[PDB]
Each structure stands twice: as structure tokens, then as C-alpha cells.
């Protein structure tokens, strides 16, 4: 019969403005704390003791330069719980030690779990297939590989991305100079999936909007659609002929078309995640050995591949002393790699 | 009719397997020329003195490259923006040393791709369609113009155009970051929102339509056979899809109008990529990303670094190393 | 021997052949440089 | 260039094995009914 579990199930699944669900018990606290943690840190909290950086509006940063920065390298991979052995329950010290970083990363991870459970739960209630939850596995693979696996393979959370606009840009440039990440075929597949997904988004939207049937008298054509109508609002047959004659091939099956729109960006993000798992271990696509053997013996042999390595060497030497303060690097002027004049 | 009329009727014929059209009569020869030169150069061209310093860079497969490292190398900095067709060289050997193939390829490509866009207008007209697919294509097309023509014009040399190759592309990006701080430029940030968002909405729309396909097949056949080309009824239940997505977020955050939805799918990546293209095209005139180097200062005046200052250190490493033999004077002014 | 009632015919249409060959060939064009190294 | 000597057969089998899988499946679809 209707026990307390079923009575609770009733209330959780009420059709209200913001659906709750069983998944909401996990999703809403964790999403709220991750977002609230980020807003709290970027507004008020420094990175002076972990990075030697200002990182909050309170210190004078703007929206592009605020961040919640990773903990000091000496923390290792500490969970850095507020009640843990590092902060010992002291909220102020916890903030100064980087506790908001693991707070956001961990509540964010469980919030993402809660969101994907929500996608399953709602799909089951309204009676649709759960492909939206399936497609969301790609955001999850990215978050887990970049914010958890990658630093877990490295020396500490310090080398995870810090949560901020400019901080993420630094992460990109670090990956170029140290990992040569642009050369990695798993990143290249990710790029193809993202740009190919954006291409499909644009071309499908434009094709539908330009093969519409005239279903009203208005020159603005949005009102000539009824959600309950049975008929296609655009001509698949005309769309197919156009693209066949323009590009050589065209979709003819709308079910395949829309599955392909799931497949392409979702697969790309999954591939990029695999490459980052490799970079967790410094298992890079850094070099082509045949190129290096030839270049070492032949000082006239030059390609764009060898040119980019010189850029990477500059990035490493010029950014490492300030970007890795725990190493206490001191690079005398005379050892810095530089071309002529610059 | 007369031969000119029959010719015009064939050119503009809606029955050709691939549409030709008047834009097509320019597109077809120019794209064939660019393709053929590109393929031959990518395989067999000798090294090119891209930076005008008699330091030739090898781009082709036969001269030591693989697919990832190979490129058609931009024309020499000594040429600058000068027009360098084959007949301006004393010999093909000279033409090749100075990067002649690059100019031939990008100029034929840009012309052919512009006609590709016009051809998309033209066929839509012949088929009785609405006309704006070509406007969506203007976004990638404008981006190609930005990296192959506008950036060279602003910097004064086709040697600074994007190379035609995978690693050459990365070289262009890294040098661009050093010289313009493009990551800190809001038009590139809009570009990222455009392509991340485009990929997101692609996956979203794909997943939502796929989730609401109407049952027309058995467990042992592809559900794709439930749709037949040209059927009049919609193949998924948009009311169910909206009922799902509106509960995922909230009701008014979801599209119930398919025309509105597909307009949004077109507009978001197209507008974002327009701003990407305009980012490159305005950094072509050295209006660069935000510079917050030493913006935060303590009470005494000590510099308090931010993440922007760490970006600056990385940019410096790129700056001091790029084109390591090309600069004689202390400022890189183009 | 009595036949198995669980057997099913398998299909691959021409478009799927073309899509699959494109995937394989492009993956090969991409990864081959790293196989040769 | 001093390339990896297994790269040729790696690339060849990478192409051939899944391609022939697809060709086998395609041709036996055409021959049905």
C-alpha cells in the first residue's frame, strides 16, 4: 500500500514549477554549494597563501581574473575537508589553504551525478527514452578526467584547473607548453567533435528555417507552427535535393540525422577525456621521434613541428618560476631561452 | 533555341546531379586549381623561406613531413603583400623557394569559397526555398578570410597568414596568443561560447529528438527504419520532448515552437563564429585582448600577481622564442 | 539438429558502409603519423 | 627518416581489418532476398 516511502515519492514528483524528484535530494544541495562556493570565493577569497595570487573582487580582480584557485602543492591530493587535519575546523584557515577548491570540485562532481540522475528520472516519468542522460555522459567524462583524474595523476590538486576565466586560460597554455596537447590525436578528435557539432547545429537550424512550408500569411514565420500539429513544418525532400546538389550528399532519414547530432559532439568530448587521462601520467603525444633524430643530425631541417617545440620551451622556462612557486625556481637571465633581440 | 540559351539553361539547370550555376562557373575552376596545387605541394614541394631570412621550412611529405607536421608554407616575408603569381618568378624553382604555391592556393580557395556561398543562394532560389543557408555559411567563410587575408593585410605580409597544415595551424595560434592575447579578447570568448554552445545544443537537440521518436519498429531492427524519406507526418513527438526538457529546467526555459528552436540552433553558433572571425579581423589591426598586467598593486606598490600575470609569463615565452632569427630590433611591431 | 529459434539476419546498408569506411580511413589518416612516429 | 618499423603493418591492418568486416556485412546484405 501507500507507506511513508510512497507518500514521499508522491510529494517529490509533484508537477511544480521546479521539479524536485528523488534525484533532487542530491542535485540541489550539491549544485547550490558548488555555485555558491564559486561566487563566495571569487568575491571574497584570496590565493595568496596557495599561489601568491590575488583572485577575488575584494582584492581588485575583475570578472575575467577572479578564481577559486587550487590548494598549495604541499597539500598533495588532500580532500581538505573543513574538519580535516589541515584546517582542523577553522573556516578562515580552510579558505586560505584552498579548501573551497575541493569543496567546489567535490560538490560539483556529486551535483553532476545528481543532474544526470534527474535526466533519467524525468525521462522515466514522462515516458521518453533516456538519450539526453546518455549524451550528458560526455560533460561528465570531461569534468572527471580534467578536474579529478588529471591532478590525481600529477603531484597534487595544485595542477588541476583553478575555477576562473583567466585561470582556465593559464591551464590551456600550460597544456601547450608542457604537454604539447595540440599534437595529441585524442585532443584533435575532440576538436573535430566540437567544431563538427557546432557545424551541424548551424547547418541543421539554417536548413530547417529555409525549407519551411508556408503555413501562414505572416512574413514573420514563427507563428505558423502548432506544437500539436502532425505535419512536418519543413520539407525534408527539398532539403535533401538542395544539399545533394550543393555538397554531393544529404541526409534523407531524420532519425539518423538527429542521432548523428548526438553522436558527433558526444564522441568528441569522450575522446578528449581519454587524452587527458594520458596526460595525468605525462603520457603525452609530445614528439615525433623520427623528426627529432633527423633534426638533431641536420641543422638545416625545419618543420612547423620543430618550430612549435621552441615555443613550448619558451613557455616552460618563462612561466615556470611564478606558475610553480613551490619549486623555488631561480632561472638566471643568461639561461633563459630567447631568439635574437626579443 | 540558340546555343547561348541552351548553355544558360544547362548552367542553371535544376536537374544536374551537382548544381553548376553562374557562381559555379567561377567556383569549379578556382576550387580545382587550388585543390590540385595544394595536393601536389603537400606531397612534393621543397622547403619555403617563410620568414624571408633564407631559412627554408620544409612542409611536404617527400621532404621529411608526416600528415601532422606537413603544410603548404606561407609565402616569404620578403614578398610581404606583393602579388606573386607564377609569371612573376624567374623560374618555378624560384617560385617554390619563395612560397608561391601558398598564394595561388589561398587566392583560388577564397574566391571559390565565396562563390560556394553565392551558389548556396542561387540553388535555394532555383528550388523555391528561403534564401539564408548562405548566411549561415558566411560564418566559417568569414573565418577563413580572417586568417588567410585580413590578418596578413593588417600585419603587412602573407608570411603571417595561417599555414595550410595541421602543425602550422598550431604555430599560428601560439604566435597569435603571444602577440594579441587572444584568449583575453571578448570576441574570441564569444567564439568559444559559440562553438561550445553549438556543440552543446547539437547534442541537446539530437538527444531530445532521438528520445521522443514514435514507436514504429520492433526490438530487432534499427529505429531509423521507422522514418521514411518524404513522409508527411513528423517522426517524433515534440510535445513529449518539450514536456521532458521543460521539466528538466523549468517550463519557460524550453522551446515549444520548432521554428523558434531551429532558428536558435542556427543563430547561436553563427553569431558566435561571426564574432570569432571579427576577433581575428580586428586583432589584425592590433586592437588586442584585455591587458591586466600588474593591475593589482598593494599599499606600498608591490605588484600582486593575478592569473592574468601568469598568462603574461606564458605569452612572453612564446614571444621571445618565435621566429628566433628574424628580429634585429627590440620591439615586434608586426 | 533442431534449429535455433534465436538466430537473426544481420544487415549493413550502403550508406553505413560508406560512413564506416570514412571513419576507418580518416582514423587511419590521423593515427598513422603516430604509428610511424 | 628513422620511423617505427611496425608502423606500416599497424596502419595496414588498422585499415584492412575493420574495412573488410564492413565489406563482408554489406555484400551479404545485398545478396539477401
Amino acid at each position: 500500500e501507500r507507506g511513508w516511502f510512497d507518500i514521499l515519492d508522491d510529494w517529490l514528483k509533484r508537477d511544480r514549477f521546479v521539479f524536485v524528484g528523488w534525484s533532487g535530494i542530491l542535485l540541489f544541495p550539491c549544485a547550490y554549494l558548488a555555485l555558491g562556493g564559486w561566487l563566495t570565493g571569487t568575491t571574497f577569497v584570496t590565493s595568496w597563501y596557495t599561489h601568491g595570487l590575488a583572485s577575488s573582487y575584494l582584492e581588485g580582480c575583475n570578472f575575467l581574473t577572479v578564481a577559486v584557485s587550487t590548494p598549495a602543492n604541499s597539500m598533495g591530493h588532500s580532500l581538505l575537508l573543513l574538519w580535516g587535519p589541515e584546517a582542523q575546523g577553522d573556516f578562515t584557515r580552510w579558505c586560505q589553504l584552498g579548501g573551497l577548491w575541493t569543496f567546489i570540485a567535490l560538490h560539483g562532481a556529486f551535483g553532476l551525478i545528481g543532474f544526470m540522475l534527474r535526466q533519467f528520472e524525468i525521462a522515466r516519468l514522462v515516458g521518453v527514452r533516456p538519450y539526453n542522460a546518455i549524451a550528458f555522459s560526455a560533460p561528465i567524462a570531461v569534468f572527471v578526467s580534467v578536474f579529478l583524474i588529471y591532478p590525481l595523476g600529477q603531484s597534487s590538486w595544485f595542477f588541476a584547473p583553478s575555477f576562473g576565466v583567466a585561470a582556465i586560460f593559464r591551464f590551456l597554455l600550460f597544456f601547450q607548453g608542457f604537454h604539447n596537447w595540440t599534437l595529441n590525436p585524442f585532443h584533435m578528435m575532440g576538436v573535430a567533435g566540437v567544431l563538427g557539432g557546432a557545424l551541424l547545429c548551424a547547418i541543421h537550424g539554417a536548413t530547417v528555417e529555409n525549407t519551411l512550408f508556408q503555413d501562414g500569411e505572416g512574413a514573420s514565420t514563427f507563428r505558423a507552427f502548432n506544437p500539436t500539429q502532425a505535419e512536418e513544418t519543413y520539407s525534408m525532400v527539398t532539403a535533401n535535393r538542395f544539399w545533394s546538389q550543393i555538397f554531393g550528399i544529404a541526409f534523407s532519414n531524420k532519425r539518423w540525422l538527429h542521432f548523428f547530432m548526438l553522436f558527433v559532439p558526444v564522441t568528441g568530448l569522450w575522446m578528449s577525456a581519454i587524452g587527458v587521462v594520458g596526460l595525468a601520467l605525462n603520457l603525452r603525444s609530445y614528439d615525433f621521434i623520427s623528426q627529432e633524430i633527423r633534426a638533431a643530425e641536420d641543422p638545416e631541417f625545419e618543420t612547423f613541428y620543430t618550430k612549435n617545440l621552441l615555443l613550448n620551451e619558451g613557455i616552460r622556462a618563462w612561466m615556470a618560476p611564478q606558475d610553480q612557486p613551490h619549486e623555488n625556481f631561480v632561472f638566471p637571465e643568461e639561461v633563459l631561452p630567447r631568439g635574437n633581440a626579443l | 533555341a540558340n546555343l547561348w540559351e541552351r548553355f544558360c539553361n544547362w548552367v542553371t539547370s535544376t536537374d544536374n546531379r551537382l548544381y553548376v550555376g553562374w557562381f559555379g562557373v567561377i567556383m569549379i575552376p578556382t576550387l580545382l586549381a587550388a585543390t590540385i596545387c595544394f595536393v601536389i605541394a603537400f606531397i612534393a614541394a621543397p622547403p619555403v623561406d617563410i620568414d624571408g631570412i633564407r631559412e627554408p621550412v620544409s612542409g611536404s611529405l617527400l621532404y621529411g613531413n608526416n600528415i601532422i607536421t606537413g603544410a603548404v608554407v606561407p609565402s616569404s616575408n620578403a614578398i610581404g603583400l606583393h602579388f606573386y603569381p607564377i609569371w612573376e618568378a624567374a623560374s618555378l624553382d624560384e617560385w617554390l623557394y619563395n612560397g608561391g604555391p601558398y598564394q595561388l592556393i589561398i587566392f583560388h580557395f577564397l574566391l571559390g569559397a565565396s562563390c560556394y556561398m553565392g551558389r548556396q543562394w542561387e540553388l535555394s532560389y532555383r528550388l523555391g526555398m528561403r534564401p539564408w543557408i548562405c548566411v549561415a555559411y558566411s560564418a566559417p567563410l568569414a573565418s577563413a578570410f580572417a586568417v588567410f587575408l585580413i590578418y596578413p593585410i593588417g600585419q603587412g605580409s602573407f608570411s603571417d597568414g595561417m599555414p595550410l597544415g595541421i602543425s602550422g595551424t598550431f604555430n599560428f595560434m601560439i604566435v597569435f596568443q603571444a602577440e594579441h592575447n587572444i584568449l583575453m579578447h571578448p570576441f574570441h570568448q564569444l567564439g568559444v561560447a559559440g562553438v561550445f554552445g553549438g556543440a552543446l545544443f547539437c547534442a541537446m537537440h539530437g538527444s531530445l529528438v532521438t528520445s521522443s521518436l514514435i514507436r514504429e519498429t520492433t526490438e530487432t531492427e534499427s529505429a531509423n527504419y521507422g522514418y521514411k524519406f518524404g513522409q508527411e507526418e513528423e517522426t517524433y513527438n515534440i510535445v513529449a520532448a518539450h514536456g521532458y526538457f521543460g521539466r528538466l529546467i523549468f517550463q519557460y526555459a524550453s522551446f515549444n515552437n520548432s521554428r523558434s528552436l531551429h532558428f536558435f540552433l542556427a543563430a547561436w553558433p553563427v553569431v558566435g563564429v561571426w564574432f570569432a572571425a571579427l576577433g581575428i579581423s580586428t586583432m589584425a589591426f592590433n586592437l588586442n585582448g584585455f591587458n591586466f598586467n600588474h593591475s593589482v598593486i598593494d599599499a606600498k606598490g608591490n605588484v600582486i600577481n593575478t592569473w592574468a600575470d601568469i598568462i603574461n609569463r606564458a605569452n612572453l615565452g612564446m614571444e621571445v622564442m618565435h621566429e628566433r632569427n628574424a628580429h634585429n630590433f627590440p620591439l615586434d611591431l608586426a | 539438429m533442431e534449429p535455433n529459434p534465436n538466430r537473426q539476419p544481420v544487415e549493413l546498408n550502403r550508406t553505413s558502409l560508406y560512413l564506416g569506411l570514412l571513419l576507418i580511413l580518416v582514423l587511419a589518416l590521423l593515427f598513422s603519423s603516430y604509428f610511424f612516429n | 627518416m628513422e620511423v617505427n618499423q611496425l608502423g606500416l603493418i599497424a596502419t595496414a591492418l588498422f585499415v584492412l581489418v575493420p574495412s573488410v568486416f564492413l565489406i563482408i556485412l554489406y555484400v551479404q546484405t545485398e545478396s539477401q532476398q
Binding site: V237, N240 | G230 | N13, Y18, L25 | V3, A12
Partner: peptide
Amino acid sequence: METITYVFIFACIIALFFFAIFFREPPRIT
């Protein structure tokens, strides 16, 4: 052997384009 391999794969792709376009399964209104 590397160059032959790269150009061979590329040539197969171009041939595939030809067949995918001119010898496609024709779209038919059902």
C-alpha cells in the same frame, strides 16, 4: 613507405567520395 602510406589513404578517401556521391543509395519517397 610512410609517404606512400599517407598518399594511399588519402587516395582511398577521395575514391570513397566519388562512390558516396555518384553511387549512393538513391533517396526514394516511400
